[PDB]
Enzyme design. Structure first.
Site, PDB file in Angstrom:
ATOM      1  N   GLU A 232      23.105  27.542  45.257  1.00 37.41           N
ATOM      2  CA  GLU A 232      24.094  26.456  45.143  1.00 37.41           C
ATOM      3  C   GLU A 232      24.934  26.484  43.836  1.00 37.41           C
ATOM      4  O   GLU A 232      24.905  25.561  42.986  1.00 37.41           O
ATOM      5  CB  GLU A 232      23.432  25.060  45.384  1.00 37.41           C
ATOM      6  CG  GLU A 232      22.774  25.076  46.759  1.00 37.41           C
ATOM      7  CD  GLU A 232      22.339  23.707  47.275  1.00 37.41           C
ATOM      8  OE1 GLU A 232      22.265  22.758  46.432  1.00 37.41           O
ATOM      9  OE2 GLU A 232      22.088  23.595  48.525  1.00 37.41           O
ATOM     10  N   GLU A 337      18.559  27.861  53.302  1.00 37.04           N
ATOM     11  CA  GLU A 337      17.942  26.571  52.859  1.00 37.04           C
ATOM     12  C   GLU A 337      18.296  25.388  53.746  1.00 37.04           C
ATOM     13  O   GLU A 337      19.476  25.080  53.994  1.00 37.04           O
ATOM     14  CB  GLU A 337      18.319  26.189  51.405  1.00 37.04           C
ATOM     15  CG  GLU A 337      17.367  25.102  50.836  1.00 37.04           C
ATOM     16  CD  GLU A 337      17.864  24.544  49.504  1.00 37.04           C
ATOM     17  OE1 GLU A 337      18.180  25.387  48.630  1.00 37.04           O
ATOM     18  OE2 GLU A 337      17.999  23.279  49.338  1.00 37.04           O
ATOM     19  N   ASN A 367      23.593  27.963  64.525  1.00 35.50           N
ATOM     20  CA  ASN A 367      23.780  29.108  63.644  1.00 35.50           C
ATOM     21  C   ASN A 367      23.769  30.448  64.420  1.00 35.50           C
ATOM     22  O   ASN A 367      24.638  31.266  64.142  1.00 35.50           O
ATOM     23  CB  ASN A 367      22.708  29.154  62.535  1.00 35.50           C
ATOM     24  CG  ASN A 367      23.045  28.255  61.355  1.00 35.50           C
ATOM     25  OD1 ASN A 367      23.639  28.702  60.347  1.00 35.50           O
ATOM     26  ND2 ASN A 367      22.693  26.987  61.466  1.00 35.50           N
TER      27      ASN A 367
HETATM   28  C1  LIG Z   1      18.873  22.733  48.295  1.00 32.72           C
HETATM   29  C2  LIG Z   1      18.655  21.265  48.715  1.00 32.72           C
HETATM   30  O1  LIG Z   1      19.491  20.438  47.953  1.00 32.72           O
HETATM   31  C3  LIG Z   1      17.198  20.828  48.410  1.00 32.72           C
HETATM   32  O2  LIG Z   1      16.902  19.413  48.732  1.00 32.72           O
HETATM   33  C4  LIG Z   1      16.894  20.997  46.995  1.00 32.72           C
HETATM   34  O3  LIG Z   1      15.523  20.463  46.797  1.00 32.72           O
HETATM   35  C5  LIG Z   1      17.030  22.471  46.531  1.00 32.72           C
HETATM   36  O4  LIG Z   1      16.644  22.524  45.163  1.00 32.72           O
HETATM   37  C6  LIG Z   1      18.497  22.885  46.749  1.00 32.72           C
HETATM   38  O5  LIG Z   1      18.717  24.190  46.370  1.00 32.72           O
END
Ligand SMILES: *[C@H]1[C@H](O)[C@H](O)[C@@H](O)[C@H](O)[C@H]1O
Ligand SMILES: *[C@@H]1O[C@H](CO)[C@@H](O[C@@H]2O[C@H](CO)[C@@H](O[C@@H]3O[C@H](CO)[C@@H](O)[C@H](O)[C@@H]3O)[C@H](O)[C@H]2NC(C)=O)[C@H](O[C@@H]2O[C@@H](C)[C@@H](O)[C@@H](O)[C@@H]2O)[C@H]1NC(C)=O
Length: 494
Positions: A232, A337, A367
């Site tokens: 992210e 994720e 997906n």
């Molecule tokens: C993906 C999601 O936001 C998740 O809830 C979070 O705990 C992880 O750290 C993030 O990378």
């Protein structure tokens, strides 16, 4: 072993969990028949039944027709994340109960996971904040090292998992933050990025950190299939982001991969490790793919694109995944994720929730229908609170551990996932499937590497739907999809 059935328990939500402890855990066609595995809200859990493949069919009911010659992506696989929180939870159980939890996931008596995502140092699902190189200004990385979170918790559990597994397991690594002395804001969280610009000593050190992590894991006889370039990257662009993060714009990520990370990995003994870009919400596609992959210096190092599911409600799969595939068909899309209970208004853990299982299979099927080669759950296990988590960002998990009782619960999410992971081995290929009329089913068809057929059908409505599946080679399967059920069908077309 013998099949042991689900011990069901209700917690007042829409369905039941299966109760597992130190000594008991639930566990698991001739030509021309089919196998059917079924799970229902009412309580059936991957139940096996069989049926004949007919030669003819008449009627005006829903028909789903396989197009075995329309061939799409090959599947990499399915799995979950070995976080600090997941390791702490599992290790909280007595060793026999731990073996049954790992077997549930990794074994052929369980649902056959073949992917494990490993954070590189701490994330929110950690009880401590740390990196592997916390000594300030250690640009040489002399003091790089794995702490006990790795050497005593994660590494040994990943080894048990590979020993229990029938299929080869692929490890995928992702970092959340760098050492803070590499960052503009000097903190593990908050808005901030690498100091300087790609090509410089900061970026060079950060890329060397990836090689050091791989060297360290290889000393413990673990090797990686793939790393992502950052978990992210968009999070660290956000003011006050509450947990570990490291922000990159798409241009920053393009030039980091081009000048630092791609060459550093290509020149290391770990040159075969695949690099995935993005590792972020699919609404960032196709823009991020266009910025990174149109620079031929960055594109030559990028094997694929990792996506997360959290803003899928805003991001139609066709305009995001479909369009990315159209522009960049040779760069695999991979879901890295997902978890429910992550919105601030949602209850973290809802024991026995059928709705949350249906969210998993509905996502997986969508997906697959838009070219994605794999799907990765987040934490492998959590406590009944959805933790531990140093910032209380609690969420749900397919397996909830109750330590004071040495017991764990398998939720509907576990089975919804197993309807794919168990029955779609690495190498299976998605093929065409068309419906004869508008319907409320979600369905996807694939061919196994041996050429046999697998079809998963999710009924998201409350009405039972009779249907037929047509395989133009072979014949017709007459069946019914009960409301709120998921089915996986299997047959040899050989
Ligand atoms: C993906 C999601 O936001 C998740 O809830 C979070 O705990 C992880 O750290 C993030 O990378
Ligand atoms: C681990 O989980 C298993 C599975 O639930 C527990 O074993 C089960 O115990 C049940 C109830 O304790 C038994 O079912 C009962 O049958 C008796 C007569 O046979 C009836 O009076 C009653 O109405 C129940 O339906 C059952 O024997 C067993 N279930 C299965 C399918 O194996 C187990 O508990 C531990 O061992 C069992 C055999 C019991 O005797 C427990 O009291 C015992 O401590 C769980 N293990 C733990 C540590 O709890």
């Amino acid at each position: 072993e013998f099949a042991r059935p689900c011990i069901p328990k209700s917690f007042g939500y829409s369905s039941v969990v299966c109760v597992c402890n130190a000594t008991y855990c639930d566990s698991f066609p001739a030509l021309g028949t089919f196998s059917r595995y079924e799970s229902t809200r009412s309580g059936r859990r991957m139940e096996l039944s069989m049926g004949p493949i007919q030669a003819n069919h008449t009627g005006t009911g829903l028909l789903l027709t396989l197009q075995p010659e329309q061939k799409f992506q090959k599947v990499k696989g399915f799995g979950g994340a070995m976080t600090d929180a997941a390791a702490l939870n599992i290790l909280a159980l007595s060793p026999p109960a731990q073996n049954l939890l790992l077997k549930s996931y990794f074994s052929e008596e369980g649902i056959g996971y073949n992917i494990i995502r490993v954070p590189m140092a701490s994330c929110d699902f950690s009880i401590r904040t740390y990196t592997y190189a916390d000594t300030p200004d250690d640009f040489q990385l002399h003091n790089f090292s794995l702490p006990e979170e790795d050497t005593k918790l994660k590494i040994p559990l990943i080894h048990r998992a590979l020993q229990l597994a029938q299929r080869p397991v692929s490890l995928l690594a992702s970092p959340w933050t760098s050492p803070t002395w590499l960052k503009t804001n000097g903190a593990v969280n908050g808005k901030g990025s690498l100091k300087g610009q790609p090509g410089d000593i900061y970026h060079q050190t950060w890329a060397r950190y990836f090689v050091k992590f791989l060297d360290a894991y290889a000393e413990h006889k673990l090797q990686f299939w793939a790393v992502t370039a950052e978990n992210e990257p968009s999070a660290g662009l956000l003011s006050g982001y509450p947990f570990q993060c490291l922000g990159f714009t798409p241009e920053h990520q393009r030039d980091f991969i081009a000048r630092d990370l791609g060459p550093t990995l290509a020149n290391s003994t770990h040159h075969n490790v695949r690099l995935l870009m993005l590792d972020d919400q699919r609404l960032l596609l196709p823009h991020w793919a266009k910025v990174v992959l149109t620079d031929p210096e960055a594109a030559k190092y990028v094997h694929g694109i990792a996506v997360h599911w959290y803003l899928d409600f805003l991001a139609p799969a066709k305009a995001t995944l479909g369009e990315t595939h159209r522009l960049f068909p040779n760069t695999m899309l991979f879901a890295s994720e997902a978890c429910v209970g992550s919105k601030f208004w949602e209850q973290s853990v809802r024991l026995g929730s059928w709705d949350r299982g249906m969210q998993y299979s509905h996502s997986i099927i969508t997906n697959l229908l838009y070219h994605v080669v794999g799907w990765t759950d987040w934490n492998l296990a959590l406590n009944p609170e959805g933790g531990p988590n140093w910032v209380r960002n609690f969420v749900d998990s397919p397996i909830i551990v109750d330590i004071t009782k040495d017991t764990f619960y398998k939720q509907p999410m576990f089975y919804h996932l197993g309807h794919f992971s168990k029955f779609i081995p690495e190498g299976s290929q998605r093929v065409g499937l068309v419906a004869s009329q508008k319907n409320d089913l979600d369905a996807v068809a694939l061919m196994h590497p041996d050429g046999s057929a697998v079809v998963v059908v999710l009924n998201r409505s409350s009405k039972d739907v009779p249907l037929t599946i047509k395989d133009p080679a072979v014949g017709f399967l007459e069946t019914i999809s009960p409301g709120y059920s998921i089915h996986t069908y299997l047959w040899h077309r050989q």
